[PDB]
Amino acid sequence: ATERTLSIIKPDAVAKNVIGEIESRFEKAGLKIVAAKMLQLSQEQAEGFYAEHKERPFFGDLVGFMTSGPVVVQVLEGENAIAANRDLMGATNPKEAEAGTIRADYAQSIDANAVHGSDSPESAAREIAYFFAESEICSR
């Protein structure tokens, strides 16, 4: 069924000025961009989003990285979009990602892994509601 998931082009990717190349992967794969915006995450924003990692030993570096430069947050919509976005991105750790995935082709470390995607329907709904008001999501 058609779905919506949250996708973020991270600071490393946006600083490489490869936003176009990444958006083209999503589009070529059949996903549509239905909302997007570029912003520099505040400390509070980054922490509120990644709240479930508050206690992990990487939290401080994650929030640091995710706030280190501007990103693009967006909503991708398409058939089976949530799982499709995961297969497109590849394994969270670029060393374990198969050739041709976004992470294998664009990332440096498990931290700077170029993009984020929601990992379930429950997390998608939560993550879209975090960055976007419904009336911002432009249907088509």
Could you list the residues known to form a binding site for ATP, using ranges: 10, 58, 86, 92, 103, 113
Query: Beta strand pairing status for 2-9 and 71-79?
Result: antiparallel
> Which 11-40 positions form the footprint of a copy of itself (CB under 8 A)?
14-15, 17-28, 32-40
Q: Specify whether 116 is catalytic.
A: yes
Smallest Cα–Cα separation from 114: which of 65, 78, 59? Answer: 65
Burial 2-28 (b: 16+ CB within 10 A, else e): ebbbbbbbbbbbbeeebeeebbebbee
Nearer to a copy of itself, 18 or 110 (CB): 18
CA quadruple 10, 14, 20, 22: dihedral sign: negative
> Which 40-59 positions form the footprint of a copy of itself (CB under 8 A)?
40
Q: Which of 31, 65, 66, 116 is catalytic?
A: 116
Residues that bind a copy of itself (CB under 8 A): 14-15, 17-28, 32-40, 69-70, 72, 74, 136, 138, 140
Which residues carry out catalysis? 116
